[model samples]
Every structure is written in C-alpha cells, then in structure tokens.
Target: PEMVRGQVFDVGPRYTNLSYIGEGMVCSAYDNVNKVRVAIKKISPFEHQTYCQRTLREIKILLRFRHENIIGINDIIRAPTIEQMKDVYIVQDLMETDLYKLLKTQHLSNDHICYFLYQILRGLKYIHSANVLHRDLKPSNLLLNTTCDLKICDFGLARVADPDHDHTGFLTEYVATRWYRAPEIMLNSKGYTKSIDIWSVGCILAEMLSNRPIFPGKHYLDQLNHILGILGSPSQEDLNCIINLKARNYLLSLPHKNKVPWNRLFPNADSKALDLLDKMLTFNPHKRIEVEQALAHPYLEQYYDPSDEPIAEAPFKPKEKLKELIFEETARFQPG
Candidate 1:
C-alpha cells in the first residue's frame, strides 16, 4: 500500500493535503491527507493504451492476491481531474522505506538477506498465483513497511500472461535492468515464459546477499557474455530446450569458472541457510524454484523465528482498517 498516511481523513475536506514523496518513469507517489498515501501516475497517451487503466488494474490484481510477502494495494485512488490532463493516482500504504535505501550506508547479515528475500518470494507467489508477471523485479521495487515486513510495489509493468497467446514477437532484447537480465530473453529467445520473473528474483537475491549487482553489464550482449562466463556454456540440450538456445551461444563459450555458491558468499552461514539461497539463484528458469517452495526452505526454518517475524500475519496490522485508524490517530489535517 503506497498511499495510506498515518492520519485521519475528514469527509467533505477539499484539497486534501497530498505530499509528493518521489517520482520515477511512470508515476509520482504522494502521502495524502495523512490517512492514506497514493501513487499518482501520468500515463502518456501511448502508454495508457497498453497499460489499460492501470491504477485500478493494479488494485484489482492485488485484491485477488492474498499474501504476506507482496505489498497489498488497498485501493486505487481516483484523481478525477478538473481538466483533461491531471495525473492519475493510486492510494496505497505508505512504506517507511525500501530495502535499497536501508542498505545505502549499512550492510545486512546473512540472516537479514534470507528473511528479506523470503518475503519477496512470498509476495511473488501471490502475484504469480493471480496470473500476473511483475516484469520489473529489483531491490528498489521491494519495500519494507513500518512493521519491517516486506511488500512488492509498482505493478505498472505487470501483465496477465495468456498461455494460448504468443508473446514472442513482443519480446524486447532489453526488458530488465541489464545486470539482472535473463539469458533466455538476452539471447533472443524464440519463446518466453512466466519464469522470467524468477530469474530476476535470483539476481536480486544474489545482489542482496552480495551487497552489489551480481552481474553489472554495460550492455545486453555483455550481460549474456557475463552470465555465460560464470555459469558455463549452456549445453546443447540446455539451449535446445531452453527458450534461447542457439549455435551462437556455443561459439561464445568461456573457460569454466568456479561456481558461486551461497555458502561461499555467506561463508559463515549454516547449511540450510546456504541451501535456500542456492536454490533461488539457479541459472535455469525452469529449474529455478517457485515462491511457495521457498517458504519451506530450511534457511527460513532455522534463521527466522515466526513468533518474532511479523509476516506470520497479513502484510498489514489489525489496526490498518479505518476502524483501527479512527482510534490510533483521530486528529485530522487542518487547513492552513
């Protein structure tokens, strides 16, 4: 939830105090009237046609997603403009900050990384279950709310994957942040699949644990080269079966490199802890594990204490509802 502020909403209150928090390519988020915060996005006419009333679409998609890991979009704030050009806003729970900001000047322990990514997996499971692909998955997009619970945000790039449809032609060589790009897409895959997001998740987990972009490539081709350099050349079957297999991949092979395992990354972490990280970062998207299986991961079982962990419950608190807000903070925004 991006829009719910920590305050009271007074009905009949015009010009609700909405504060601009930040802006990215698609939208700017605001802390509105102190009670709820929302994201106000201005869609270029070109984008609106493809994204399709995205604020509501995101809310509707999230409504069907009931999970603790994913950020819950409470409501799509409708900013009915007085003119034809006002930006659209989607009301959401304002997070304290995101994982990227938290890691800016500090470092996370192995346990912290495991716990955080576990939340990411939980959130993705819900989104995938709802048949939506995050398309853009990265550390900046993963957020931590007041309770220190993790939630995924920014669904403007999300899409419903139709099994019967061929999305091959629409495929772009550079869809994800170049460093985290998947080989299937990078090698000009003949076909694509939903597991693409899982590849991004693996890249994110590596970044979280490594405290840096695992594969920081200067370009798309460089990205593919970097991945192949590390993971070894895709076997004939790997490419033939995998979406992007081709003879070109064979010619570009590099010397065999030592495997980068979680145990080595978090040298002090226990076996189970390392096990989970290893599972998520596997190169093959098909072999890449799903979110549900990640929860049962032994790393989670040992490092995380459900009693101390907040995500054991829903993403928000019992007091998140209006009834709860009424008692927590009754003071409404005063007009200046």
Candidate 2:
C-alpha cells in the first residue's frame, strides 16, 4: 500500500508520459491524460536561485492571472518536503503548437494573422493592466491552436511594476530575446516601460508577414545594426533620450540612410495593418503605439470584442510572500 502511494501515479486524473516537449526552469513533458493531451511542467525546488525564483513567480502569476488569451493553469501537483520534491508538476491544456512552430510549418492567411495578432494585443493589454510585463514575449512563448486562438506563455523574464524599484542584487541586462528586444532596452536606456513588449509584438507581426525574423542579428551589436539597416538611423530626438552617450555616439557614427516605408516591406499587406505595425515598431519607446490602440486599429477592429476590457487590480503578492504561498499550496496538495 505504501509503495503504490509513493509511486509516480500520484499525478491524478491519471496520465502517462508521452514525450519530452521542452525545458526552462520547469521541463515540459507531453502526457495523455483524461483521453486528452496535456503539458506537464515539473516544478522542482532543487534548482539554483534564479530558477527557483522564476518558478515561484510563474506559479503565483498563473494562479492569480486568468485570461482566455493567456495560457491556462489547470492543475498543480505539489511537493511538501525534500523526498518528494521531484514529483511536483504544473499541468495545463496542451495546444497544437506554438506560434514559432506554426510559422515554420504553415503560411498564415491575412485573416489568420489578424486574429492571432489581436489575441496577443488583447492578452498584452490584460498583462499591462495587471502592472506586469511579459518580458519574454517571443513567438515560441505564444501557444496556438488549430482555430487560431493564441495564448501568451513563459513569464520567467516578466517584471512587475518596476524591476529597478527593488533588488537584492544587480539585474541582468538581458530580458527579452535579442531578436525581439526594443531599442531602449538594447541601448540600456533608463526607465523603460511596457512599450518594450509592444516592440516585440511588432517583431512577431513582421516575422509572420515575411516568414523570417525581421531583424535576425548574430549578437547585440549586430542586432542593433540589423534594426538600423531597415529602420535607418535613429532620429536626433531618439538619440537624445538615451542616457548613455557612448551608445548614442556609436549609433550616430553609423552612416545615415532614409527610412524605408512599411508599404515597401509588406507590399501585399493591408494598408491598415501596415500603418499599425509602423507605429508599433517606433524607435522611441515613448512614441510607440500602446496595446489598446493597436487592438482598436482598423486592421483588427472587426475582431475586437467588447468583453475584452482591462481587468481591475489583479491580486499581486510580494516576491517573498509568493514563495510562502507555494509552500502553503504544497502542504495542501502533498501533505504526508
């Protein structure tokens, strides 16, 4: 009886591991459970400081953040103590694929692209309303289904309010991936805002249109050059905003080039969509288009739903308290 009780079958509603999906702090596994496939993210407490902190943050956010456009958290199997820590799992409905995979495999129609982009902005509006930034809002983190539904996932890099407000140590320069990173973040500008995510949306939008990364840079320097090559040299006003003169000087050193109109890049794209994308990708973070405005843009107006209002203040727990809540949840789910 004791042997079976401690067995891996503890993950209930009964499931069998099918395949390894991916890894982050929580390694994902594909499972066949309840006759439906599900993704099980094993949340081990045995990781390093960054991993543990990120896992805790993700758990707290997912539990409190419920939204259709965002990935859902259906179940959490916990670990009360050391011996059983490895068995903990966070389960969610498995999607057909993520946007990154879909882009590689299939061509999306204009309608499909509009629908998907709308969901991202809708989800983003909700996230920003909650005073959180999905710092890692890349294509791979955007889960998708056959019906074109999109859910934002992977919040490990997400920061609430302001990251600089509190700190036990130095924060990493890295936040969003290099390809989708904003000009402000790339230049280490002070007091960056939610507009960073907006820049990412533009990158995804461009990628979907071209079937390739709009700015594929080998590294940070190359990344900036890639962006400058297309958007041309930064404006004097944009350069003036950068606190770092060295960065400003380097950008100014590059030869000037005329801005390429969005129409030229997406020749077949609807004028409305092109207009929206241009605004979304503005070099000046302050001037970048907001998520709500993007949703209201003519390109997605038809698909915008009245019910997609920004939610009221979401329940936010302090980082320390969040860790306590995880322990509390563990006691409820894994008491022995």
Candidate 3:
C-alpha cells in the first residue's frame, strides 16, 4: 500500500486507508492536496492493450460527460514507471452511500421517488444523447448524498457506439443484470437501442416503489418468465419481432397470458408513477417512452426544465485517431 501513503506514487492524496467502498476496487481516501474526501479507484491491469484502452475510454468518456446528475472524475494518477503500469488511480468525488445501501433501511415518499427517477432519466438522457450505452445500470451504481441528490457512476462498461459500426450485432446479450434487463434484449432483438436503458429505468422505478425487484429471476429464461408472469405473455406482434430463432420458438410455445393491472402490481404507488412506469416497461423498445417525453409525463412534468438537458458531441472518430486520442488523454498511465 505504498501508493496509499504517497510513497512510491507520490501524487494527490494522503489516504487514511478506509475500508473498501465498492467491489474492493475503490476506497475512500483523504485528499490532503485539495483538503477533500474522494473515492480512489484502483483499476488493476488487464490484457496489455485491453487495459489501456478500457481505462482511457473511461477517462475520456468521463471527461466528455458533463451533468449534475452524472458523476465526474477529479484526477487520474498513473504509476511513476512503465514496469509498474499495471496500477492506475482515478480520483472522484465521494458520496455518502449508493442507492443499494439506502434501499436496505430507507423508505421513500412520493417526492423522493419523483426526484430520484427524474435525475436518473435526465442523466440517462445525456448518456444516450452521446450514443453511449452505460451497459450496466443498477442501484449500486447510483451514488447519492444525504440530501438525496443522485449521480450516475461507473462507466467502466459503457460502450461508445461508432457511427460506422454495423448495428446488426452491436451489443451483447448479457449486458445488464437480470432484474433490470429489458425483455427484447433477453429475447435477442436485433434492433436494440438506447431504449434498453429506458427499460432498465422502468425496472429501477418499480423496485423503488415496491421495495423489491419487479422481476427477479433465477436465470435468463426465468427472468423472461418472471416478466411474463407479471406483464403476461407476449403478443403475436411482439413475438414476430424476435430475431433469435430459439427465443422466438420458446416464446411461441408459452401459453397465452394477460397483462396485470398496474394497481395490483404496485398497490402503494400512485397512479401518476404507475402511468410513467407503464410507458417505460413496454415490451417494444421502439414504443418505450423516450427520456424527453418521460420528463413531460404528469409524474415529473412539474419538475421539468429545458436547461437541465445536456447535449452530445460527435460519437465516432476514425479508429486510429480514436485510439490516439484515448492514449494521449491518459498518456500518464501508458507503459513504456
């Protein structure tokens, strides 16, 4: 832990060696340089080029991402020598706890629900606008403060879509967690888009209202079954949209099921919340409520502000330039 004490890599902070905050990869450290607390992420080495590219992408993505609802990186420090290139440190603002920790003991009111969901949608809107897939959206990744302000975190798995890349197989099947995964993705829909994130938002909102996941399945098939069990079986029209032969056959064989009313599913949640949730959870990704429209829904319409929306710049660069840009940005960490 020489790095923690500013010995080997004498950099920004003089850490107190706090317990691991997240996945053991992150820890709380006192930044004596700035006199603030920050989360110090220790990203270990991966396959040679793979490690650098991923780390650079995360840094560049965080740099481009500017939103009050999205977390920002404070500083990045790399090992002093090339031989020690395996270690990299990313410093970012500290939060009291994540949503996952809050959910265990806290009960939210309507105001809390509206505010949280609004922030999530707004942050997500920015990410999608950039043609970036967060790829991983869950309670643990949502950092929060004592006042309940939320900021989206962990862009390690976020994929920046290249404009020239073919859309046929852009995304992987196993992306989001089972509970928050979208139905179309599970069934291998060919036309997956940012709407997959909208589906995840729906699941998160449902969980917040119900104090449990809307769909908690044992596996991929079971996840689909759980969703079907609630929303009922897919219609022939939705089934026809499936591109995977196996998934289509499995769905076709299932008995017909009917949609469960929102009231019964979320008895305690008010109608306004249910209405927005309904639109977000649609089986058809194309039909799911876009973030812009969702902001206008009655549930959060009153809180809408045009100024809060963040804009996106160019998404794709030529491969060589993109690689060069990332390398240049995080050149401090490049191995000799």
Candidate 4:
C-alpha cells in the first residue's frame, strides 16, 4: 500500500490503499484489508532498546488479553527476511475517533458520560484482574466508534504485576501523562498499585462532566499543586504515604488548602456522579475506588452486568529479555 505522500507499505497484497492517518511514537495508517477497513501501525523497534521492549510488551499483551473493550490485534506483518525486519506492522480495528477528539468536538449528555465512564471501568476491571496496570489511561488512549462504543488501547507503558506479591515492587515512575497522574506517582512514591489508574479514570470523568481538564497543570510540580488546589491538602496519614521525604516536605511547606466541594466544581452533575468522582479522586491511594467497586456504584448501576464482565484466563508473562522476545515474535511470522 502507498500513502498520499508516496510512502509505501510492504505489508503484502492482503492490505491495500494505506493512507496516512497519524503518528506519535509509531506511525498509523488506514488500510482496506480483505474487504474490511483496519488500522496499521508501523513500529520501528530497533531504533532504540526502550522502543523494542515497549513494542514487544504491547504485542504480547494485545495478543493475550481478549475483551470487547480492549483493542484487538487483527494481524502482524513483518518484512520477509530477518535482515530487513527492521519494522513490525500491526493491524487492528479502525475506530472512527478517540474520546479526546469526541470530547473536544461536541458536548456529551449525562447519559453519555455515564456509559463512557462505565465502559472504561469495565475494561479496567478485566485488566487489573490479570494483575496488569495500564499505567497510562487517558481520553486519547480510548478509541470510540460512531455508535459510542469505547475500547482501551495503547499498552506500551503497561506492566504485568507478580501474582504472588502485592504491587509493592519497584516500578517505573515515568508512567502516564502529567494531568492524569496520581499523587503517588507524582510524589515519587516507592511503589504504586493499580489504584493509580483509578485516579486517571477520576480525571477523565471530571473532564467529561465539565468538558475541560479539571487539573490542567503546566509542569510536574504545578500538576501536584493543581490537584492539591482542588483535592486540598492530604491528611497527615495520607502525607505519611509519601515515601520520598522531599515530597512530604514539599507538601508541608505549602499553606493548608481546603478541599473544594464536587457540587461546586460541577454544579449540573448528578449527585451520584459527584459521589463516585469524589471516591475515585481520593488523595489516599488506599482509599481510592477499585475498578469493580466503581462499576458497582449507583451512578453506573444501569450499565452494570456481573455476567458480562470477564477476566483473563491467565496472567500475561513476557520474556525476561527484549532480544529473546523479539527473536521469538519474529520467528512466529516466518513463512513455512
């Protein structure tokens, strides 16, 4: 397939008319493959070891985790010869737009917000059940179709937790964008649990209700201050959770700030919606609402279904080394 700019994709005859769509860390193109429209993401893993690992991790998770709310991998196309396999092409479902675009372009009703939030929590429930933290959860990462169906995408920053241990192990601090980052993450806490994702969901919910980011901070420090400005100062016990002494001192230095009422922040929002938002945005990670609990909240009761929600059959376990995973994945696509 060839792009309008003369960029060509050697993805084989099954796919055709690849048109440039978007790009970030990876380049995305829209394609017509086998009489169906699909999205093709071209990844250059060999450019950097970090990119290689992320590419491998995303592929493994997307292949293993199967749910309607999670993006599905349709096909993986690689260059024929190992010497030419510098890039990996992944084909997936083509969504009309993402939540970020939808929110920016139009207004959403209370019912729209409820259903969107419900789906996000519903998907997070399944991911957390597999002991995986999305690490990155925001509106843009959520793909939406014309019918308002939402699916969680982008697993590059996702991490699989050890089943035997609680999520107290050392994890990367460089996770999630600034606005949606949890206080535990921004404060450089020693260890963060799945609750970090709940905080992001809370931010998304608030954004939907108000049609703007509730905490639009300029930098990391400003980001924390923005959250504190709205959530107010954490309690002494909550402050104690900050493993980094410097972060704790930083909080102590700031003058006491009172928590803002959710009703005042979102006057037109439903009381139930405000209640669930408050629970989710709790400063204490331990007190944050879990994905299952969020789905069970009265605000989402109309969309809750015990039987419909499903968990992974087994936890995802990636190979210890990037080279090994790359070799293994490349071999899988080899011609017989």
Candidate 5:
C-alpha cells in the first residue's frame, strides 16, 4: 500500500514466499505484506480447505467485535483462484510481540501482571458478552497492541455462542491446546460451553505468576493429569451427564488434597486476591467466574479504574486521527 497524491493505493500480494512458524504448518507470516508492515497468516494450501471459511468467519466476528480490549482487524485480502483456492490473508493490528514472547525478555512485576491480566479479561469479557466464544485463549493468542493494551487474536478458532445460556460445541478434534484445556475438556466432556475459556484463563494466570508453561501435556491423559494433579480430580457433581464425557473413573483415583490452591502457591497473597483466584479456577465449571466477573473481582480491584497509574493510557497526544488515517490507507486497496 502506498499513498500517492494524498491517496493511498494498495493491493494484497498473491503468494509471498512462505516461512515456517512451527509444527507442520508453513506460511509467510513475516515476509511480504504488500508495502505495509502488517501481520499476516498464510496457510500453504490445504486439501479439504476450511481456511477460507474460517478466515471469513473470523473476519465477520472480528469486524463486529468493537472493544478497547479486542484486537482490531485492519484489512482482508483474497487471492482469486479457480483450480486452487488462492491463499487468503487477514491483516490486523501489528503489535511488537505477543505476551508470551514479551515474558521471555524480562520478569513482570506482580502489579504489571495484574495489569496485563486485567486487559486480557476485559477483552474476553467483551467477547463473552457479545455471545462469542474464543475457543482458544492463551498468552500467544493475546496480542500486545501499540499502547501495551491487549486485544484477543486468532478468532480463526473462535465460535459464536449464546450468552444467556450455555451453547457447548461439538466433541471433535479438541478445541484448545492441552495445558490450557479446562477440566471439562480434560474429562473428555463434550458439547463444552464457553466456560472452557475460563480454564485457559486459570492456566494463563498461573503461567504469568510462574513465568512459564505450568503444564505441558504430552497427551490427552497426560493433560488431564497435569490439571487433576494440580487442581485435584473431578468430583461426582462434575460428572453428572456432561455431553460425551468419559474419564471420570480415571480422575477419581487421584488424591484431592494435593491440588494446590492459589493461597498455598502465592503465600504472600492477600485474602481478597486468593478469593478471586479460587473462584476463577474452580474445577466446577458452574462455579467458575465469567470473564466479566473475574475482571471485577477484588484481586483485580487495585488495578481497576486505577488512578495510581493509568497503565494503558498514552504518554503523548491521543490517537484521535489514527483510525481515520488507517481507514483512508485501507480504502486504497479495498474494492469499491
């Protein structure tokens, strides 16, 4: 994209040389971005391609999601094709790095961690309220925007569910990565509701506190053990006919007391702090606090609407025209 005569001219590159980001998947995430330094995810051709559908669905969901917390999608480009469905790329706010990578560089103060977690919950709250389920919620999936504020990314795996009632998804090729998987998932619970994300919140929070992946499960059983070993096994109440669920008997064998509560872990933690955490990570999905409630919990009260330091506010002039500038730049490439 280029601005000529005060007008921006833009276009999406057909197929930039692909590079590897990890396990089996290969795509150009850092290479060609037309002319803009935008974040792009390109999937190198799939047989039963759902990338297109998923990409479109993500686009629809993202464009509709407007919150200070949710990451914004700036542009979308499709490579027209007949024989092979050309690679489709979704352009979004390009951040310096993800929370996961940032953590690698330096140790985060407890207060800083609280701030970061607050932003993440805020974004998740907005999403949950919108009746959308972010099937996968992890540090990597939470991008750090320009102001260090968070915006949930990777809606490619997210789904829309009813906010008023639980709308669990199908029990298929698992929804989230294992360590982040909720007990419902670990128990092989099917038709799992959006609360699955609540489990991920616990994992992320614990990881932030520990500054590492708390549980890297080697397999499904391994994953279940990782949580059950730490949080204790599923109770009889948690078993009552959750869709397609199995593995309760196995969980029953694990000792319950071994489950390390947050207070036991964060020894210096204030009562209010521990209280909030217990509710958020409760093994019973019914007891787990929703994203909105978690954001308001007393553990986070120190940071909420804080005057001590506006953690995410701008240091210089406000970006009132940034949106207009981006809109004009995007219009250059978009079809009228």
Candidate 6:
C-alpha cells in the first residue's frame, strides 16, 4: 500500500494507495486493491456524542439499504482492540466525482438533467419507503460516475421516521444545508415531514438548469429571504401551519412579494422540467410533490422504470442500545 501523509491505511494488505481526497466532518481517501477502486472514509465517532450517534445511524442505514442509486458499503474496518477503536473506517464504491464538482466543470443537456433527477428521486423513494428521512440532501452528497450514474451518499444526518410520533420526535432542529432546507425547517415548524427532502431535490433541479444555486443565501435569514423573494410570501393558510411564533411573526412583518415566473428563472429549460420543479419547491410541505410522484412526473417519463425502481421490503427499525451494538459489531470485523 502506498502511504500518504496524515492518513493511516492500516485496514490490511488488500487495500493500498490511501491518497487523501477530501475532508469535512470526516476525512476521505481514494484507494485501489484487487484491480478495483474504492473510496474510504475515516470517521472518529467518539469525538462527541453527536458524532457517535451519527456514525451508528449512517452505518446501520447504509448496511440495510441496497439499491443501484444508493451508496452501498463495500467494507468496514476497525481496530482489533476496543481501546484503539476510536476511529471506524468504511469503504464504499468509488465514483468519478460528485454532482457539486461535475456541475462546476460540465454543461449538462436536458437529457442529462432528466436522467440525473430521475435517479435521485428514484433512490429517495426507496429511502423514504423504508421509513427513513435523508435529512441532508445536497449536490455534494450526490455521488456520480463518469457514466452519469448518481448515488445518494452521506447519511450522517439521516433518521428513521417514528411511526407513532409527529415528525418532530427525535429530529434535531439543525438539519441540512441552509440553501437546501425546506421552508418548514427554516421556520422551525413543530414537526416536518419527508417532503423536506423533496424541497432539496427542487433546489438541485434548478441548480442543474442554471448551473448556479437557485437560492444562494449567506445566512439563515438570507436563505429565507432568497426563497421568499422568488416564491412570494406564504399564504395565510400556510402561515397558520407554522408552529413557531417568532418565525410566523417574522413572516408577517415582511412585505408581500409576488411569485416569479418559472420561465423567467430558467429561460431555456423544458416546460415539463419547470412544472416538476414548481411542484417540488412548493412553500407548503404538505403540497410538495412526493418522491413517487416525482418519479412518475412527465419530465422523468423517459427514464422511469417500475421494475428497476424497487423499494425496501420492510421499514427500518432503530435498535435499542445502539452504541453497545455498534461497539460489538466493530470488534467482530477482522482486518483483511
């Protein structure tokens, strides 16, 4: 294995050339072994309770979900000794680049946009069907291959939906990037639904057409303003749904703004594409297009396939004593 500075490829002989690729909350590396390429992420879950919880959540969900458009776990490596198990290493399918990087350099055609959007909603439908919410959905989290295959990745913010409770139960207030966050989340609604992810897909679709973020906000307030400036002020009925008094009051104080025409925003975009975008970006979460509906939208008709787009056989149930189970599972992994 070719060693790189500031990285440890101690997973074993089968993995080699641990070249650093990127880092955010976790560090990533590009590796090659047995004539196949892979991406490895080193997560130090013990750094904080939140990180620990996120690590376990990500591992559990990734291991359970199996779909072509969903990033799957290739391998998991951990230290042999419990005392040395501070970091967990995960190996996953290596992609040529991510949507964020690709958008910067390449100009996408209408077909390209349609196919990509289809894949995203397709994968999301599967995820949501399993009673899981991918709280975080952004261009950076969407991995891509040179062949234009798109896979949803990075589940650190994902959570299983509680069937018996409102969406607020066990959900953290701070979720998703500000620009991609749905209005309900921005307004601090008492509870939010799976439609929050649909909002993000809308933002991504607009970005694909314009090659720039549709709602590029510098801060939380700025983000809200950007959305409202284009979508117009929420209706009285929509305002009534907001549970946060301060947020509702803030909206009431703002001057009324009329909605912008989709054509004006995306001058050359296909009409069908614009129609789906409008439905997905609806200010009211309840009215936002669901993932299954999105998959069937006219814009994605060319790519929709019932047999290919499979859902989870059963909803995922979070295990009790997750921390202990995670530790026990880590101890069982033998370095290859």
lDDT of each: 0.57, 0.74, 0.75, 0.81, 0.61, 0.81
Query: lDDT per residue, candidate 6, 52-107, as tens digits?
Result: 78888888888889999999988788766656676678888888899999899988
**Which candidate, 2 or 5, has the higher TM-score?**
2
In angstroms, how far off is 83's CA in candidate 3? 3.3
**Per-model root-mean-square deviation over C-alphas:** 9.1, 4.5, 4.1, 3.1, 9.4, 3.3
What is model 2's C-alpha RMSD? 4.5
Poorest lDDT segment (10 consecutive residues) of candidate 1: 327-336
> What is the per-residue lDDT of model 5 for residues 227-333, given as tens digits with 9 covering 90 to 100?
66667655667655444323545455456646677777776545675676677678778778887678778778866653321222211111223323323333433
Tell me how far the alpha carbon of residue 252 in candidate 3 is from the true structure, in angstroms, after superposition: 1.3
Number of clashing pairs, model 6?
0
Considering only N, C-alpha and C atoms within 3 Å, which residue pairs clash in candidate 6?
none
- CA lDDT, candidate 6, residue 230: 92
Q: List candidate 3 segments past 4 Å from native.
A: 1-19, 22-24, 47-53, 161-172, 190-192, 316-327, 332-336
Q: Cα lDDT for residue 116, model 2?
A: 88
| lDDT tens per residue, model 2, 36-67 | 67777666554455666777677767767888
What's the count of clashing pairs in each model shown?
19, 0, 0, 0, 0, 0
Q: Could you tell me every candidate's TM-score relative to the true structure? A: 0.70, 0.85, 0.86, 0.90, 0.73, 0.90
Instruction: Give me the displacement of residue 83 in model 4, in angstroms.
Output: 1.4
**TM-score ranking from best to worst?**
4, 6, 3, 2, 5, 1
In model 3, pairs of residues that clash are none
Query: What is the per-residue lDDT of model 3 for residues 1-336, given as tens digits with 9 covering 90 to 100?
Result: 444333333344355545456552777777776777788787654445655566666788888788889999887776554455455677888899888887787898988989999999889878888888787788988999878889998776677544233133212467678788887766664323677778888988998897788899888767888888888887778767666677778778888889999899888898999999999999877678988899889999878886767766665334344445544576754345
Per-residue alpha-carbon lDDT of candidate 1 for residues 1-336, written as tens digits (9 for 90 to 100): 233354322222322444556542223343445555444433322134344444434545555565666666443322232233222333456677787787675577776777787777766766666666777888788878776788887675667755354234213556656776677665444223557777788788767765777677876668866676556556555555544335344433555555655565566555775576566656656676776677667776754343433332232112123222222221222222
lDDT of 5 at 256: 69
lDDT, model 3: 0.75
Writing each residue's lDDT as its tens digit, candidate 4 over 30-58 gives: 45435767888877767678888888878
Local error of candidate 6 at residue 149 (angstroms): 0.7
User: Against the correct fold, how does model 6 do in TM-score?
Assistant: 0.90
